[PDB]
Amino acid sequence: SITAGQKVISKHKNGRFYQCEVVRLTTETFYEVNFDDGSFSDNLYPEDIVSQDCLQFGPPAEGEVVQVRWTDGQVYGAKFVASHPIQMYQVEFEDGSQLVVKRDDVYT
Amino acid sequence: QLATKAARK
């Protein structure tokens, strides 16, 4: 795997692959939920949970019924599945532009 | 990026 300062390959905003450098490692927590319509999201922010205060009191229990504010502003019902501590990599390209990406998007 | 959804199974 990857440490900081390392030179890696990742996709640029322009769509092409370039060598870029790894400047920061962050561990970022994403929530996963199963919506009532049979769909799921595993990349929710904790504060997208509106039926409890997760920044302050942590994640709902696994399998708990929650209400989720989605990206159209509207609230949907769901069940909590998991919180994911995910390795993030802030990468810098030759032109000074930075992205924040996860492991499957960075290449050794 | 914003959260996204998809069908499972």
Numbering used by the authors:
A (entry chain A): 898 to 1005
B (entry chain a): 19 to 27
The authors write:
We show that these DTDs use an aromatic cage as a general mechanism to coordinate trimethyl lysine and, most importantly, the sequence specificity is largely determined by side-chain interactions with surrounding residues.
In all the structures, KDM4A-DTD forms two lobes (HTD-1 and HTD-2; HTD, hybrid tudor domain) with interweaving β-strands. The co-crystal structure suggests the H3K23me3 peptide forms extensive interaction with KDM4A-DTD (∼540 Å2 by PISA31) and such binding is mostly mediated through residues in HTD-2 of KDM4A-DTD. The structure of the H3K23me3-bound KDM4A-DTD shows that the trimethyl lysine group of H3K23 is coordinated via cation-π and/or hydrophobic interactions by an aromatic cage formed by F932, W967 and Y973 of the reader domain. H3T22, the neighbouring residue of H3K23, plays an important role in the H3K23me3 recognition by KDM4A-DTD. H3T22 side chain forms a hydrogen bond with N940, whereas its main chain forms hydrogen bonds with N940 and S938 side chains. Unique contacts with H3R26 also contribute to H3K23me3 recognition by KDM4A. The H3R26 side chain forms a hydrogen bond with KDM4A N931 (2.9 Å), whereas the main chain of H3R26 forms a hydrogen bond with the KDM4A-DTD G935 main chain. Besides main-chain hydrogen bonds between H3R26 and G935, other main-chain hydrogen bonds are found between H3A24 and F937, together forming three β-sheet-like main-chain hydrogen bonds. The intermolecular interactions determined from the KDM4A-H3K23me3 co-crystal structure involve all residues from H3L20 to H3R26, consistent with the clear electron density of this region in the structure. The molecular arrangement of the H3K23me3-bound structure defines an H3K23me3-specific interaction network and suggests that modifications on H3T22 and H3R26 could play regulatory roles in modulating DTD binding.
